[PDB]
């Protein structure tokens, strides 16, 4: 056996070669195919575990694939070289090859028969007639002899009470194997349309199956091999009579009563009820899997045939209702181990196959009232009483599962169960059975929910429980159903008028969170299709959600479920949005302190703060809405620094790439609006928005082509950047100061990350800042912007005693704008002798000396898969060196990035090296 694997591996490692070569694929490819098929024939009963069959079948369909690529063009005449089993001829085009496969189709080796059939059925259309097996087979049959195909179908095998007890003599297996061989010969030819159903029926096969039906019912360690080789044949007998009966029934009267008598319709009964006596034992897996499809196919082929009464008169004596009435005892949980159990299991299995075959009322018709398999109603009643005292098992649970499913496979019976389910005392039944009742109740949707929801305000606990059960069991196979879930959700959406004393007032504080979790279930159970544009009962569910945000309720820690629902609620408009803003202010100003911390950091109250703001960040983290953004931004910049500052920045950069480039500039415009309006403000609050609210967005990758906020805001504040500092009053001058500082910050961050060849260029970058397509160059706004930021911090601060600490910030932000535009321009040559350096002190000018403080001495201290999925199903069920002081200046780091850029741009350098030495080589400048 280990000798052929060498040659087969060798061909699997040379077959990709020598197909690219002549003078060798022209003489012995037929000999190669027949010799590999013949070695397959020698390796018939060796083993499947050795893997040789896989190797040689891979070899032969790897060589047929390369004979079909060329012999379509070259089925021509030449002096070939002979195979084993041929006479010496001079031309071997394809004719005696396909006739060889025709003659040796009835080789009684099983792995060769399938390969010969599936070779010939694709080797047909290469005869130059290019015909089909219907007409070609009769075309050559008519001039050779019609009784030659039965000789082919019998091969050389056209032909005791000692063998009543089965024995395994070395030719008895050959007779049974010849029976199976001749049986599986004509199976493919009857399933296909090669010859007529009576062109071969006209049988010796009928005499053989008559002998075997007379001899079916029948060395103890080799007889089981004879059992297996016996029981591999009767299933193909059943397959053959299915493919004969479900074809054209011209032979359904030619099939005489020598085989369709009580023998076949008795062994089918024995296949159904307890087939562990005919040889189909326990332990096999492949044939025990391939049994009840063809065993049901035999019944579903026979109901189109006039032997349906034969089936009734051979079945109603065996699988009568008297059997399933008499098998039920009283004490089912005790020493009565298997004497009822295995027989009832086999019977319930057989009736399940019967119901799959579609003969339940055809076999055991129903009774008095209507639509009631009364056997099934009594099975339900006995299953319900079977636990009423009270023991348990596992195989008895499998008994009860199959038994209840057989009781419920009849039809419209579930309303009896809904009537049963209400009085432990009853809920114990749904406790002990939870996977069967839910998948039964899923089946008759759109009417079970009404019978359920009628019983609502009387047994609210059990109906809420069974709703949660069917909801979560629908979520389990949400990856399989995916339409039953949304239909169940939209049907329970259409019955909200029955549960009005649930989301209401003066109910005890359990039902509110119960229906809240039910809302979370029914809304996360689908995607975002059942919420929008007048889908269902949207206003009633909305106003119940609004009334659930009450004040007698639980305060905060289950409102997190409500705020995680808020991604669904937020696509509507004002009114409802105004109600939303009112109730969100009503919660924020009643549950969040004004100070920075305002709590001990060890109490649960600080963890409650982190809890609620984490939930609010969870809400905003997946619905980029301009309402929640301002809702956190107004509670953020109340004190100067709260606890979770890094969380807000990480979430802002998380929002900054989330898609929908339209709405990003919308969020930009919303927070710019809450910056920009006339209002009573603090200059800290007016500064912190443009400081650390939208710069986190703009600095992060918002969109590299969002030039809308670039073009459409510049001539809205370039006038106030050119306007007059009206020095009259504190609470009007400081506002203009902060506004100019904010426009400086925005211009800084836009000319930070923006190239020169798309703003400097002669395009629509200019046509929006200036009125239409004007005459222009590279610096039109970036000359007057340079002019106004250099108007800043070059007029001396002699008569300047109004607000100095903020004017330092003003000069700092204006020089930040100056350095951002001087790097964003095309850095052409020594324009730094004209701008950015060399102030003229004859008019008392200054550059560094205005923004450096010079009235503070710094310290300088002494040295400074799939199971996370199966867990998430349960989760659905319940839920730079450093900065010290001088680096801490928010001007020095862009300055050193600037001079580093001027390094990596190309005596002493004029404006920034020699002039800066001249500012430092003498103590004409002070210490700071």
UniProtKB/Swiss-Prot annotation:
UniProt-reported outcome of changing residue 399 to P: Loss of interaction with C1D
Effect of residue 343 to M: In a lung squamous cell carcinoma sample; somatic mutation
Processing after translation: Autophosphorylated at two clusters, the T2609 cluster and the S2056 cluster. Autophosphorylation induces a conformational change that leads to remodeling of the DNA-PK complex, requisite for efficient end processing and DNA repair.
Chain residue ranges for the region called Leucine-zipper: 392-423
Localization of this protein: Nucleus; Nucleus, Nucleolus; Cytoplasm, Cytosol
Location of N6-acetyllysine modifications: 138, 840
Interaction with C1D, as annotated region: 392-423
TPR repeat placement: 593-626
Function: Serine/threonine-protein kinase that acts as a molecular sensor for DNA damage. Involved in DNA non-homologous end joining (NHEJ) required for double-strand break (DSB) repair and V(D)J recombination. Must be bound to DNA to express its catalytic properties. Promotes processing of hairpin DNA structures in V(D)J recombination by activation of the hairpin endonuclease artemis (DCLRE1C). Recruited by XRCC5 and XRCC6 to DNA ends and is required to (1) protect and align broken ends of DNA, thereby preventing their degradation, (2) and sequester the DSB for repair by NHEJ.
Quaternary structure (record): DNA-PK is a heterotrimer of PRKDC and the Ku dimer (composed of XRCC6/Ku70 and XRCC5/Ku86). Formation of this complex may be promoted by interaction with ILF3. Component of the core long-range non-homologous end joining (NHEJ) complex (also named DNA-PK complex) composed of PRKDC, LIG4, XRCC4, XRCC6/Ku70, XRCC5/Ku86 and NHEJ1/XLF. Additional component of the NHEJ complex includes PAXX. Following autophosphorylation, PRKDC dissociates from DNA. Interacts with DNA-PKcs-interacting protein (KIP) with the region upstream the kinase domain.
Family note: Belongs to the PI3/PI4-kinase family.
Connected disease: Immunodeficiency 26 with or without neurologic abnormalities: A form of severe combined immunodeficiency characterized by reduced or absent T and B cells, recurrent candidiasis, and lower respiratory tract infections. Some patients show dysmorphic features, severe growth failure, microcephaly, seizures, and impaired neurological functions.
The name this protein goes by in its record: DNA-dependent protein kinase catalytic subunit
Whole-protein residues included: 1072 to 2141 of 4128
């Amino acid at each position: 056996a280990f000798k052929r694997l060498g040659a087969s591996l060798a061909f699997n490692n040379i077959y990709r070669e020598f197909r690219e070569e002549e003078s060798l694929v022209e003489q012995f490819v037929f000999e190669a195919l027949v010799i590999y098929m013949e070695s397959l024939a020698l390796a018939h009963a060796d083993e499947k575990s050795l893997g040789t069959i896989q190797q040689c079948c891979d070899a032969i369909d790897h060589l047929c694939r390369i004979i079909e690529k060329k012999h379509v063009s070259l089925n021509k005449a030449k002096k070939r070289r002979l195979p084993r089993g041929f006479p010496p001829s001079a031309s071997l085009c394809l004719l005696d090859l396909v006739k060889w496969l025709l003659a040796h189709c009835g080789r009684p080796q099983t792995e060769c028969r399938h390969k010969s059939i599936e070779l010939f059925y694709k080797f047909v259309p290469l005869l130059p007639g290019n015909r089909s097996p219907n007409l070609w087979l009769k075309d050559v049959l008519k001039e050779e002899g019609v009784s030659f195909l039965i000789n082919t179908f019998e091969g050389g095998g056209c032909g005791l009470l000692y063998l009543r007890g089965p024995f395994s003599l070395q030719a008895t297996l050959c007779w049974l194997d010849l029976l199976l061989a001749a049986l599986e010969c004509y199976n493919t030819f009857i399933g296909e349309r090669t010859v007529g159903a009576l062109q071969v029926l006209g049988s010796s096969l009928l005499k053989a199956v008559a002998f075997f039906l007379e001899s079916i019912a029948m060395s103890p360690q080799e007889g089981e091999r004879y059992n297996y080789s016996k029981c591999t044949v009767v299933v193909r007998i059943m397959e053959f009579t299915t493919t004969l009966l479900n074809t054209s029934p011209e032979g359904w009267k030619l099939l005489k009563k020598d085989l369709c008598n009580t023998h076949l319709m008795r062994v089918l009964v024995q296949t159904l009820c307890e087939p562990a006596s005919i040889g189909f034992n326990i332990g096999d897996v492949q044939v025990m899997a391939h049994l009840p499809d063809v065993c049901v196919n035999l019944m579903k082929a026979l109901k189109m045939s006039p032997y349906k009464d034969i089936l009734e008169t051979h079945l109603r004596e065996k699988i009568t209702a008297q059997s399933i009435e008499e098998l039920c005892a009283v004490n089912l949980y005790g020493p009565d181990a298997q004497v009822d159990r295995s027989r009832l299991a086999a019977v319930v299995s057989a009736c399940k196959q019967l119901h799959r075959a579609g003969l339940l009322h055809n076999i055991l018709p129903s009774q008095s009232t209507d639509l009631h398999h009364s056997v099934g109603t009594e099975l339900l009643s006995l299953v319900y009483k079977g636990i009423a005292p009270p023991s348990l098992d596992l195989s008895c649970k499998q008994l009860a599962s199959g038994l209840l499913e057989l009781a419920f496979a009849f039809g419209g019976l579930c309303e009896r169960l809904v009537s049963l389910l209400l009085n432990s005392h009853g809920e114990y039944f749904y406790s002990l059975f939870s996977e069967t009742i839910n998948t039964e109740l899923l089946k008759n949707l759109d009417l079970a929910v009404l019978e359920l929801m009628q019983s609502s305000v009387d047994n609210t606990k059990m109906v809420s429980a069974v709703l949660n059960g069917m909801l979560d069991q629908s979520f389990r196979e949400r990856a399989n159903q995916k339409h039953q879930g949304l239909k169940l959700a939209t049907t329970i959406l259409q019955h909200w008028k029955k549960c009005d004393s649930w989301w209401a007032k003066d109910s005890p504080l359990e039902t509110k969170m119960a229906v809240l979790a039910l809302l979370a279930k029914i809304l996360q159970i689908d995607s975002s299709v059942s919420f929008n544009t007048s889908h269902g009962s949207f206003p009633e569910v909305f106003t119940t959600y609004i009334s659930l945000l009450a004040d007698t309720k639980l305060d905060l820690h289950l409102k997190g479920q409500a705020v995680t629902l808020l991604p669904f609620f937020t696509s509507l408009t004002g009114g409802s949005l105004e109600e939303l803003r009112r109730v969100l202010e009503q919660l924020i100003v009643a549950h969040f302190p004004m100070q920075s911390r305002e709590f001990p950091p060890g109490t649960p109250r600080f963890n409650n703060y982190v809890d609620c703001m984490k939930k609010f960040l969870d809400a905003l983290e997946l619905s980029q809405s301009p309402m929640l953004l301002e809702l956190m931004t107004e509670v953020l910049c109340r004190e100067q620094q709260h606890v979770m500052e890094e969380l807000f920045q990480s979430s802002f950069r998380r929002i900054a790439r989330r898609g929908s480039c339209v709405t990003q500039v919308g969020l930009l415009e919303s927070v710019y609006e809450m910056f920009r309006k006339d209002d009573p403000r603090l200059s800290f609050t007016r500064q912190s928005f443009v400081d650390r609210s939208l710069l986190t967005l703009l600095w992060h990758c918002s969109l590299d082509a969002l030039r809308e906020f670039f073009s459409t805001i510049v001539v809205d504040a370039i006038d106030v950047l050119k306007s007059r500092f009206t020095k009259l009053n504190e609470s009007t001058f400081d506002t203009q100061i902060t506004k100019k500082m904010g426009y400086y910050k925005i211009l800084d961050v836009m000319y930070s990350r923006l190239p020169k060849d798309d703003v400097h260029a002669k395009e629509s970058k200019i046509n929006q800042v200036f009125h239409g397509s004007c005459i222009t160059e590279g610096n039109e706004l970036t000359k007057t912007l340079i002019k106004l930021c250099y108007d800043a911090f070059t007029e001396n601060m002699a008569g300047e005693n109004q607000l100095l600490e903020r004017r330092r910030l003003y000069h700092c932000a204006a020089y930040n704008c100056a350095i951002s535009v001087i790097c964003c321009v095309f850095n052409e040559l020594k324009f730094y002798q004209g701008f950015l350096f060399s102030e003229k002190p004859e008019k008392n000018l200054l550059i560094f000396e205005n923004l450096i403080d010079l009235k503070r001495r710094y310290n300088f201290p002494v040295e400074v898969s799939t199971l996370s999925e199966e867990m998430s199903q349960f989760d659905f069920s319940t839920g730079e060196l450093e900065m010290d002081e001088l680096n801490r200046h928010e001007c020095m780091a862009p300055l050193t990035a600037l001079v580093k850029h001027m390094h990596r741009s190309l005596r002493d350098l004029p404006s920034w090296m020699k002039f800066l030495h001249g500012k430092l080589g003498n103590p004409i400048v002070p210490l700071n």
